[model samples]
Target: METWVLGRRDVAEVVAAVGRDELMRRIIDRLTGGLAEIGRGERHLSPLRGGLERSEPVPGIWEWMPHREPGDHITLKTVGYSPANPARFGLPTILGTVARYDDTTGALTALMDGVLLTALRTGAASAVASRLLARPDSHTLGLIGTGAQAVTQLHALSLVLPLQRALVWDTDPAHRESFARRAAFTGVSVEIAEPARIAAEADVISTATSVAVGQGPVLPDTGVREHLHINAVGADLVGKTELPLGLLERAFVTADHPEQALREGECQQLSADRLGPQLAHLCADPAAAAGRQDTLSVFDSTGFAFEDALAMEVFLEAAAERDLGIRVGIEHHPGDALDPYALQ
Candidate 1:
């Protein structure tokens, strides 16, 4: 089958044409709509994500995220995450690609780089949650880790929230300084602050630190505001979580996916009964969560395959409209299925 290949530049062109704000807004809308449909029993869910960890040359994990809609396309993302990439190879910590296959014909239909999509969707996911659960007057955003993810997180949140200032901190002073300079595009005031100050003052906080697995609770729970909302973005591995156990125990937590969150996210630390509604349930009736602004709420965001699938649809549609990307026969379509040399 003919396959549409969108390289990094092609994807950038698509984003440029669609506009970043509009693109993320589209993803947020799609994600929320998809989740609401699932919550209302309008659709079946794809399988939970799966992964394999290795400590060979570098300690990291590679994961496979697959999304299937019975008669439609099967979308898959193969992502490799290595924390050492930045210092060791100057590469982004997360790298991957996404592919779509026609379910009936089992034909590869589309392929594209997943790096930018991952960042964009992640930021969009947090925005979906923050918009639903955070307080209405949340103006200051606190970011605990100033990495590549932090930039998009700020960008997406700025579009949805009334964010006038961002308080940021990182173990590396240079990262803190760099994010301050780079985040200027968002038109929000960025300040360097300690994690404690962030938890205490900012109405909305996002933690995207690459804290080593089994060594977590990166941000302290003390001095945190009663109406605070936190988006825990870094925990996608078992035994790797960012929020303090005490905070999780007391807060009303929402997870993108319940089973997956319990397996690897901050929800891993809490009992299933302690968990609030899943993202799907909340999206079905966001008003149910609006009243939660009085309490501390947390969105345990572990990237989901459904999100990637929806995002791929968005990019594909945009690319098609703009006539971007290339179409190539990536598969062998023999004249006869049974004849190996039919084409020859």
Candidate 2:
């Protein structure tokens, strides 16, 4: 089988062409279904490493997650922070790539840009949760921390909800201003607001800040209500969180993957024992659950590996259709393929 390699630019083109809404929706459907399979204990997920500091220094994670049926494939993803890269040097956040391999043959089949995949998949998870959990007439959106992922979240949400206006807040006023200016072009009325204003006024709130834990709540407890739907996407690591434990306690909480989210998502602050019964595992049934009710609903979106697998499959299929991916030679001859010692 021929292995396909896709670069960042190629992936960007695909994203632009496929359209964010369509791509995100497809990813959500696949990922949610994949998680349901996982809930049944039908699949296997390898332990993920949060990576070491100093020697590895940058914040990164690796997961080997696989799902059986429809032909088994394993997804291996490693996301690292590369401070040296100019695009992410100041931001200090670097997204990584995902590789898919045939389970039986163990052959690397496809490689695609993980940055786009990450943003799309993460945003889609939030949107999917909103579809299930948010009130039916949610038209206003509140965005805390305007960054790279914010735009995609907005894009995915617009598809699921009738987002008429948005409130944006960021530590840096300039960043918030930039977001408003960009958003205006998209025809979405955006205004800069304080954290309280966002929490109180918006029907659906998306928190995408990269704040440290125990720092301060992204959304203060005073303004949050039972009618709001919050998508917490920033807390993807142990020491990173956006909301207070009390908020989680009141809200009907759902996680993309309980195993991964409990360790890395905002729910990390609460003990597993405390979160055990209250928290709903999203993978239980992607389509059967009633996410919206009188109570507050929240989706703690720590990036999941199943999303990467779904994205890889989508990108590979797109690449094949467009004939738009890089191809590299791995095996020089049939003899090399037969050599068992050449596995390294």
Candidate 3:
């Protein structure tokens, strides 16, 4: 089988070509659509066990899929998050690769750098949730944990809402300052602040970090408004959430994947019966989002295989249209049908 490889620059071109807003919007539709199909048993998921099992109780996650709707691609996405990457490794905290296979043949079709796709889809999922669940007039935004995913979180939120300024905080002071300064081009002014300030002043709040337990170190809820929306992005692994059970128990919640979220998301901190609604359901029925955008609505993101599949389809389409990437053949074909031994 022929193999296609998309390096960093190649994938970056795909994201740039798709444009951030359009990427976010399309993925949202893909997410909602995929989930609905999943709910109806039209899709298949290979149980979300650890990738790289005495797992789920420790750190990070890797995923698999038998097949994905809208295409015949089967994907295995392996990714990880390192909080100290910038200071220690001089790289973005998120890193991984996605392997694609032809379902019938089980032969490699493509390999991609998962770093960009993860960031983009993560942002896309949150933006969809914010648009669907957050208050209609939410203007000011707040972000806790100024790391890789949080930056994309801000970019994603900007697409659906009009924010004049955003209040951000982080345990690492240097990153907080850097993230605040980098958000300028979005046309929204950014400032560094305490969690309490972010909780109070911002209309929408999101958490994306690699904290020990999902609680207050830099995430304080003192000033959180009665009507607000929070996107709990980090803490996909078991026992690694950034939101405390107190907030989780009190807030209205929606999960990208209920079964997976129970095993990995902030919703994992609470019981299954307590979940408000699944994101797939909310995405299908817009009326489910009706009511208060001002009130607390939580989107517990655990990352889904369907999302990776959706993103892969988008990347494939872009790559094909632009005629980008190269093909390599690792499998040998028989040159002489009568002399099969000659192939080796």
Candidate 4:
């Protein structure tokens, strides 16, 4: 089997080629189909964990996803650390790698930079939620936390909806200013404003931040009303959240994967009984839970293994077509001989 190594530059090129519309569609199709195949069974994923002190301060998390079909499996891992700060001396806020392996032989087939993949898949996930839940006439977008992920969210969103203007806010004024300047180049009207104004006027609101636990309610309930869609992306881990309980209670809540959402998404704060009623009671009946028209819709995304697997598949296909990847031998065969036991 051929092994491919895709560096950061190659990953960026592949992401650009995929485009927003194509990526969003592919992800939605893959995820929706996977969910159907699982049918509340047949899909198994392992737990993931990371520690800052171990593995280069850039803690790493890994997931093992095996599909229903035999010989189809994927393992994904992500690591993050600050590389620019001299005080930390050689640390980067975000740096990681994703590896894809063949299920039959357990041979590593490809390795690609995970930073862009994470951002791309995440943005695509949000785009899927917006397409399925947001109103068709939605145009204005409000962005909170103008970080690296924010740019991708804007790009992905534009593909799902016809956005004309954007209102943005960041804790650091400079970040907001930079976002405004950069957004102008995209031909969208961008204004840096307080959080209140963004929530009040925008039809779609996205939050992407890295704040710690107990950062209570970045989005206030006052400005939010009917027909608004919220994509909460920042809070993907336990104890990390961006929305308040009140907002979640009021909106019709949805998630990429309900099990993970209850553990790590905004639903973490709510009781299992409440979540079950909302998910089992409401979502169990698709007609009732398809999403409400002329009302608020909320998607609590906590990231999923299927998304990473989908992205890896897309990247590998692009790499094969272009022949634009480096091959490295990870598993060695016995000298000039095919030894089954040696392989084991």
Q: Select the stronger candidate by TM-score from 2 and 4.
A: 2
Query: Residues 54-169, candidate 4, lDDT per residue (tens digit)?
Result: 23433222333222235775565555434233225643345667777777777777788877777777787777667666777788988988877787688778777889988888
Q: How close is candidate 2 to the true structure, as a TM-score?
A: 0.84
lDDT of 3 by residue, 122-143 (tens): 8888888888888777888889
Give me candidate 4's TM-score against the actual structure: 0.81
| Per-prediction TM-score to the true structure, in the order listed | 0.97, 0.84, 0.88, 0.81
Off by over 4 Å in 1: none
**Which is the better candidate, 3 or 4, if ranked by lDDT?**
3
Write one digit per residue (lDDT tens) for candidate 2, span 1-344.
Answer: 56778987788777778875577778777766666566666764444435533223444333333433336776777675443232345643546778777778777877777777877777777776787678768888999988777877787788778889888898867778889765654467888899888888889999997565456578888766668888888854467678877888877676665676778777776666654321224446544346354468777777656667776777777667777878876643354667766653
Q: For candidate 4, list the clashing residue pairs, or say none.
A: 81-92, 81-93, 82-91, 82-92, 82-93, 83-91, 83-92
- Residue pair clashes in candidate 1: none
Candidate ordering by TM-score (highest first)? 1, 3, 2, 4
List ranges where model 2 is wrong by over 4 Å. 39-49, 54-71, 81-92, 184-186, 276-292, 331-344
Estimate every model's Cα lDDT from 0 to 1. Answer: 0.89, 0.70, 0.74, 0.67
Which residue segments of model 4 deviate by more than 4 Å? 15-69, 81-92, 184-186, 276-290, 335-344
Shift in Å, residue 162, candidate 3: 1.8
- Global CA lDDT computed for model 3: 0.74
RMSD of each: 1.3, 3.6, 3.4, 4.3
The TM-score obtained by model 3 is: 0.88
